[PDB]
């Protein structure tokens, strides 16, 4: 009561003093300055392929390195490889548990990774000589529900749980080689910086935190949102990042400047959003949503710059080519569209 | 070149081929969500009915897969979106045991009115009848201390009861149908239905009521598609 | 940053009076259903009342029908609860709490043990 009501008032100033710092180094916005920016025009971006094979909802989706074979993990226990070229199923590959929640492409391209509902993260192997994908490893150790996971090498990869904790795993061994704590809630989503010495993670408690890898410590908080985040991305650079949550709002964050530099809402858009991802330039911002459509938004201006409307249910996951010719987008209607 | 895109097209027809059994089996079985609200025992019926079990049953040479959470958080906002496409929820309601039956109103209350929820259908289990039998009958365990409304209510002139029971008993289990039953009809946002039932480890054949309103279920989902 | 303040908890006389308030800051307070809960000694939190986004639906548990009243203002983002004529069974912590997702009518996990968007409460003692 007196020692706990004495560490709360010195969070609380300790808050203050956070807040006047951001709020010292914040002099003109970023729409002040760039408001003479000659804008994007319009964006049309129609349908090319559609990849159909898939019996439930699509949950996860991931491009490869090489920007022409794609994974998608559906939620009637199916892990499908494609090739987004030629609209050919490379590999499908029966899940343990038909409840995945995301899945992950190794960027070598030997591996595969999915977990779900049963708090496992299974990682198969695909260039197996002579034989068939049988499942390398399976990662056990959270307590909640995995709701993102992505590699770094062939030999590492970090886990995003419904346990409020991230995890960072080494393959070969098995055992988590780092916990990041810190989350109040189910962290929904992560992204890895361009380099891999950082990522960002977002939560149900409506806060991104900076993870720095090799030591294992939470760098920085950000607060702007006001629910829960359901998605997040870095900028192409590593500077900034993008989050969107249910608020039906996408924020751009700083790294340096520590603070969030500018909002992409509207009025007529009150359903929250899904995932987000950038353009290889980095100056569209491309979000899906629950009203069944993505929206193009100047990542600069704030303006929305077209729509890709062909979905009838929920889009769930969204992804650009690391080339930047292609954007997948995959839907609770159990098909991959690809957007050009 | 021409050979790998052949021994692709190869690969695809095979993959096309196994496909095609699998969307053969998935059509066949029929998933249903068991969420009890917490504390209610019902691991006992789910015995004669890590992070999450599953139990298969067969009724009539159907097939049925029941689902049940075991090693998740608290929360659960998030990871409930993925039983949306499930053909039933299955609540059991630990009526009794005290405010739980308040905490069942209010979950039940909060998967009716949910934006994705909103087409699945909830079979409607209250579980432990006669633990609360007997708390009525002792005139003791009141659960009036919590619903303040339970006098001034009747039990309709409707509404058999069965012969092993007291009028008492009958009028606590159906104030409890009817509390759902005002949430399940005060709102008309999604095409679902409720089917209240009573249950508790004296009843075995739990799955014949699942199986019947599972039927009635797929009847009126085939039901709509012969309107606009 | 989402922060819940509740202000006016004490002490009080059985049958005595109490206006707990709650302000609320770091987002449109006029998108959300509110809710208070509270978690008495010794046991688990526990639903109380709840108001809609407007004012139309209003909602309290068994236990206070009649003598609680809820209230929300939001020209200054401010919720009320008025206690009438209070009880020894109504000992406990009071929340404000607010659930997760603007434009909806479900509020999921307002209750649970670690939610984010709940207050630090404030105590209410009713005691002779």
């Known amino acids: 009561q007196s020692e706990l009501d004495q560490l709360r008032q010195e969070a609380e100033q300790l808050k203050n003093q956070i807040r006047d710092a951001r709020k010292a180094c914040a002099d003109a916005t970023l729409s002040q300055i760039t408001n003479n920016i000659d804008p994007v025009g319009r964006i049309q971006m129609r349908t090319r392929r559609t990849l159909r094979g898939h019996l439930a909802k699509i949950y996860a989706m991931h491009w490869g390195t090489d920007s022409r074979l794609l994974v998608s993990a559906s939620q009637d226990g199916k892990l499908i490889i494609w090739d987004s070229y030629t609209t050919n199923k490379v590999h499908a590959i029966p899940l343990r548990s038909s409840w995945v929640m995301t899945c992950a492409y190794a960027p070598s391209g030997n591996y595969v990774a999915c977990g779900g509902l049963d708090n496992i993260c299974s990682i198969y192997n695909l260039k197996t000589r002579e034989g068939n994908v049988r499942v390398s490893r399976e990662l056990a150790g959270h307590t909640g529900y995995l709701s993102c996971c992505r590699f770094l090498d062939d030999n590492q990869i970090v886990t995003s749980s419904g346990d409020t904790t991230c995890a960072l795993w080494d393959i070969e061994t098995g055992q988590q080689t780092t916990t990041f704590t810190g989350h109040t809630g189910d962290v929904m989503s992560l992204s890895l910086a361009p380099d891999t010495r950082l990522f960002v993670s977002g939560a149900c408690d409506a806060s991104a935190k900076l993870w720095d890898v090799r030591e294992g410590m939470c760098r920085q908080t950000f607060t702007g949102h006001e629910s829960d985040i359901n998605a997040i991305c870095f900028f192409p650079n590593g500077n900034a990042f993008a989050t969107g949550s249910d608020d039906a709002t996408c924020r751009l964050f700083d790294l340096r400047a520590d603070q969030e530099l500018m909002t992409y809402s509207h009025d007529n858009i009150i359903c929250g959003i899904t995932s987000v991802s950038f353009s290889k330039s980095g100056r569209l911002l491309l979000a899906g949503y629950d009203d069944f459509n993505c929206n193009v938004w100047d990542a600069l201006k704030a303006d929305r710059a077209g729509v890709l409307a062909g979905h009838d249910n929920r889009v769930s996951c969204l992804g650009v080519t690391d080339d930047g010719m292609a954007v997948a987008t995959g839907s609770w209607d159990s098909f991959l569209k690809i957007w050009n | 070149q021409r050979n790998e895109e052949k021994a692709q097209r190869e690969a695809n027809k095979k993959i096309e081929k196994q496909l095609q059994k699998d969307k053969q089996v998935y059509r066949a079985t029929h998933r249903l969500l068991l969420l009890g609200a917490g504390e209610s025992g019902k691991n006992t019926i789910v015995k004669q009915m890590s992070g999450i079990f599953e139990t298969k049953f067969q009724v009539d040479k159907v097939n049925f897969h029941m689902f049940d959470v075991g090693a998740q958080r608290d929360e659960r906002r998030k990871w409930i979106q993925c039983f949306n496409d499930v053909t039933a929820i299955i609540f059991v309601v630990a009526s009794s045991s005290y405010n739980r039956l308040q905490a069942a109103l209010k979950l039940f209350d909060s998967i009716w009115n949910n934006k994705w929820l909103r087409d699945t259908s909830v079979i409607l289990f209250l579980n432990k009848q006669d633990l609360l039998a007997e708390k009525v009958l002792a005139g003791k365990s009141k659960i009036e201390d919590y619903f303040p409304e339970f006098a001034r209510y009747t039990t309709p002139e409707d509404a058999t009861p069965e012969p092993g029971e007291d009028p008492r008993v009958t009028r606590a289990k159906y104030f409890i149908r009817d509390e759902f039953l005002r949430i399940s009809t005060a709102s008309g946002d999604g095409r679902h239905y409720c089917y209240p039932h009573f249950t508790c480890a004296v009843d075995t054949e739990n799955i014949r009521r699942v199986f019947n309103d599972c039927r009635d279920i797929i009847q009126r989902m085939h039901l709509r598609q012969y309107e606009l | 940053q989402v922060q819940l303040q509740e202000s006016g908890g004490g002490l009080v006389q059985p049958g005595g009076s109490l206006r707990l308030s709650c302000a609320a800051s770091g987002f449109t307070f006029s998108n959300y259903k509110m809710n208070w809960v509270r978690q008495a000694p010794g046991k688990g939190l526990e639903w109380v009342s709840d108001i809609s986004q407007s004012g139309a639906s209003i909602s309290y548990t068994g236990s206070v029908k009649g003598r609680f009243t809820i209230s929300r203002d939001n020209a200054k983002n401010t919720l009320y609860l008025q206690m009438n004529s209070l009880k020894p069974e109504d000992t406990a912590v009071y929340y404000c709490?607010?659930?997760?997702?603007?434009?909806?009518?479900?509020?999921?996990?307002?209750?649970?043990?670690?939610?984010?968007?709940r207050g630090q409460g404030t105590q209410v003692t009713v005691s002779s």
């Open positions: 709490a607010r659930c997760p997702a603007p434009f909806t009518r479900d509020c999921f996990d307002v209750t649970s043990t670690t939610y984010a968007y």
